[PDB]
Amino acid sequence: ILLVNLLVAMFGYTVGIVQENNDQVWKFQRYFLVQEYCNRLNIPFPFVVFAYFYMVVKKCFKFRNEDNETLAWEGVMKENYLVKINTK
C-alpha cells in the first residue's frame, strides 16, 4: 500500500512535469527517424539485400554563387530583425 502508492504519485508528478515539454521532445526525436529514413537510397526492405550486392558492384569497380546569394538574402532579414528589436 505505502510503497506502491508512493510510486503512483511519483509517476503522476513526472507526467505532470514532462508533458508540456513532451511535445517538444517528441518532435525533437522525430528528426532522427526522418534522417535515418531519408539518408539511405532505400527500396522496400526484403529486396534491400539485392541492392547490397550492388554495393559490392561498387566494390567491383572501386565560392559558388547561389550559396553566396542565399547568404545575402539572409542578411536582409537580419537587418529587418535588428530593426524590430530596436523598435521594441
Binding site: 510503497l3 506502491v4 525533437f28 527500396i43 526484403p46 534491400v48 542578411g75
Partner: protein, 478 residues
C-alpha cells in the same frame, strides 16, 4: 575626459591631430563626443589608418567604438589578418579561460570543442570573422559579440555554434561565476537563432529551407540543423518551420493534405496507385515510382514485413521445431540474414556512434543470440544442445518483440507517450531499491524466526527473496 579634451584640442598646434584626440576619447568612454566632433565634417577618413585604434578598441572592451568604426568604414576581413589573430589568441587571451578550455576538452569532449581546440592551438603558435567571434564569445564579452555577430554572413550558424560552445563551457565545475555568465550568454544566442530563423521562414519558405542545409564552407564543419541537434536545442526544431521541412521531407512526393488511410489503403492494394485517391503535388510509371520512393510508405511496408517476421518466428518456435530444420526455419534464417545485412550497413555508415544508441546495442545483442541459437541448434543427436538452442531462441524472441515499441514511436499519439515512458526509470529504480530493502529485512526475519539452519541455497533464496517478492502482488505469505 571632456576637460582633458578641451585642453588638448585648443593648443593651436594639435588642432589637426585627430589621432591623439581619438585615442584620448577612446581611452575614456566618450562615444558621443567622438561622434559629434571627430566623425562629422567628412573631411579626413583614410579608412586604412584606423587599424591601431581598432586593435585598441578590441583589446580594451570598447564595443561602441568598434561599432562606430565599422559604421564609418572599415572592412574586417581586410583588417583581420593572421598577425592580428595570433596576437589576440597569444597575448590578449586570458589564462583562466584557457584552463577552463583544457578542463572542458579533457572532461566534456565533443566535435565542436575539438574543432575550436584545434584552431585555438593553431593561433597560439579562411573565415576570419567567425574566428574573431569565437575569440570574443569564449572570453564572455557579451557585447563585442553582438557587434561582430551583426557583421557575419552565416548568421544563424554562428548563433547555433556559439550556443553550443557556451552550453559546453557552462559545465566546467570550477569558477562557477564564469559558468553562470556563459550559461546566460548561451541562452541569449539560442533565443537569437530561433527568432531570426522564424523571420526568415515567415518571409519565404524555399530559401529558408535552403538555409537549413548549408555548411558555411566549414564553419565548424557542420550544418545549421546538425548544430541545433548536437547542442540538444529542442526549441529550434519544435518550431513550425523546421517541422514543416521535416514533414515535407517525410511524405516525399505525396502531398501532405491527403488522409493517411488513403495512403495505407493504396499501400495494401498495390496497383491502385493509378487513381486519383493520392495527390502527388509536392506518366503512370512516374506515379508508381513516386509512390514507392517516399519514406512514409517504405517505412509502412517495412513494419508490415516485420510483423509477418514475428509471426513466422512464433510459428517456428512453438509449433514446428525438430531435429533437422524444416523449410520455414530456413526461411526464418534467411529473413534474419536480411536484418543482419541491414545492421552491418548501418554500422558501416555510422561507425562509432552506431554503438551510441541503445537500440543498436540491443539490436546487435539479439543478432548475436540468434547465431548462438544456431550453433547450439545444429548439434543434432544431442537432446541437451537442441533444447538449449530452443531456450536461446525464446529469449531472443523476447528481444525481437520488445523492439516493436521503438518501431512505433512515429505516431502523433503513440509517440509522445512512448517518450514519456522512458523518463520513468529513476522512479522505477527508487521503488526497486526501497522494495529490496524491505523485502530482504522481512525475508531474513521470517526465515530466521521460523526455521533453523537451512543449508541449501535455493531454499534460502526461495524463502528470503521470492515469497516476500510475491507479497507485492497481494499474496500474504503463508
Amino acid at each position: 575626459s571632456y576637460a582633458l579634451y578641451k585642453a588638448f584640442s585648443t593648443n593651436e598646434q594639435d588642432k589637426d591631430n585627430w589621432n591623439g584626440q581619438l585615442k584620448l576619447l577612446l581611452e575614456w568612454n566618450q562615444l558621443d563626443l567622438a561622434s559629434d566632433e571627430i566623425f562629422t565634417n567628412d573631411r579626413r577618413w583614410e579608412s586604412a589608418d584606423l587599424q591601431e585604434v581598432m586593435f585598441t578598441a578590441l583589446i580594451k572592451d570598447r564595443p561602441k567604438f568598434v561599432r562606430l568604426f565599422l559604421e564609418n568604414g572599415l572592412n574586417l576581413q581586410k583588417f583581420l589578418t593572421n598577425e592580428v589573430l595570433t596576437e589576440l589568441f597569444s597575448t590578449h587571451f586570458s589564462t583562466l579561460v584557457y584552463r577552463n578550455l583544457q578542463i572542458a576538452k579533457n572532461s566534456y569532449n565533443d566535435a565542436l570543442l575539438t574543432f575550436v581546440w584545434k584552431l585555438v592551438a593553431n593561433f597560439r603558435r579562411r573565415h576570419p570573422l567567425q574566428a574573431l567571434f569565437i575569440w570574443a564569445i569564449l572570453q564572455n564579452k557579451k557585447e563585442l559579440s553582438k557587434v561582430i555577430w551583426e557583421q557575419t554572413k552565416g548568421c544563424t550558424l554562428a548563433a547555433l555554434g556559439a550556443s553550443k560552445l557556451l552550453k559546453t563551457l557552462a559545465k566546467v565545475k570550477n569558477d562557477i561565476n564564469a559558468a553562470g555568465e556563459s550559461e546566460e550568454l548561451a541562452n541569449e544566442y539560442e533565443t537569437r537563432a530561433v527568432e531570426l530563423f522564424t523571420e526568415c521562414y515567415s518571409n519565404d519558405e524555399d530559401l529558408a529551407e535552403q538555409l537549413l542545409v548549408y555548411s558555411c564552407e566549414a564553419w565548424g564543419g557542420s550544418n545549421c540543423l546538425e548544430l541545433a541537434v548536437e547542442a540538444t536545442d529542442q526549441h529550434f526544431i519544435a518550431q513550425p518551420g523546421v517541422q514543416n521541412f521535416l514533414s515535407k521531407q517525410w511524405y516525399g512526393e505525396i502531398s501532405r493534405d491527403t488522409k493517411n488511410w488513403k495512403i495505407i489503403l493504396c499501400l495494401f492494394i498495390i496497383p491502385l496507385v493509378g487513381c486519383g485517391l493520392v495527390s502527388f503535388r509536392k506518366k503512370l510509371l512516374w506515379y508508381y515510382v513516386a509512390f514507392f520512393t517516399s519514406p512514409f510508405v517504405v517505412f509502412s511496408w517495412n513494419v508490415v514485413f516485420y510483423i509477418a517476421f514475428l509471426l513466422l518466428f512464433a510459428y517456428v518456435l512453438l509449433m514446428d521445431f525438430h531435429s533437422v530444420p524444416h523449410t520455414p526455419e530456413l526461411i526464418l534464417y534467411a529473413l534474419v540474414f536480411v536484418l543482419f545485412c541491414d545492421e552491418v550497413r548501418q554500422w558501416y555508415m555510422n561507425g562509432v556512434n552506431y554503438f551510441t544508441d541503445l537500440w543498436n546495442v540491443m539490436d546487435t545483442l539479439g543478432l548475436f543470440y540468434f547465431i548462438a541459437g544456431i550453433v547450439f541448434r545444429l548439434h543434432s543427436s544431442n537432446k541437451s544442445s537442441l533444447y538449449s538452442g530452443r531456450v536461446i531462441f525464446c529469449l531472443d524472441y523476447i528481444i525481437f518483440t520488445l523492439r516493436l515499441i521503438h518501431i512505433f514511436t512515429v505516431s502523433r499519439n503513440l509517440g509522445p507517450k512512448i517518450i514519456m515512458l522512458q523518463r520513468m526509470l529513476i522512479d522505477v529504480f527508487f521503488f526497486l531499491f526501497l522494495f529490496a530493502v524491505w523485502m530482504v529485512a522481512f525475508g531474513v526475519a521470517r526465515q530466521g524466526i521460523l526455521r533453523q539452519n537451512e543449508q541449501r541455497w535455493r531454499w534460502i533464496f526461495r524463502s528470503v527473496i521470492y515469497e516476500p517478492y510475491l507479497a507485492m502482488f497481494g499474496q500474504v505469505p503463508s
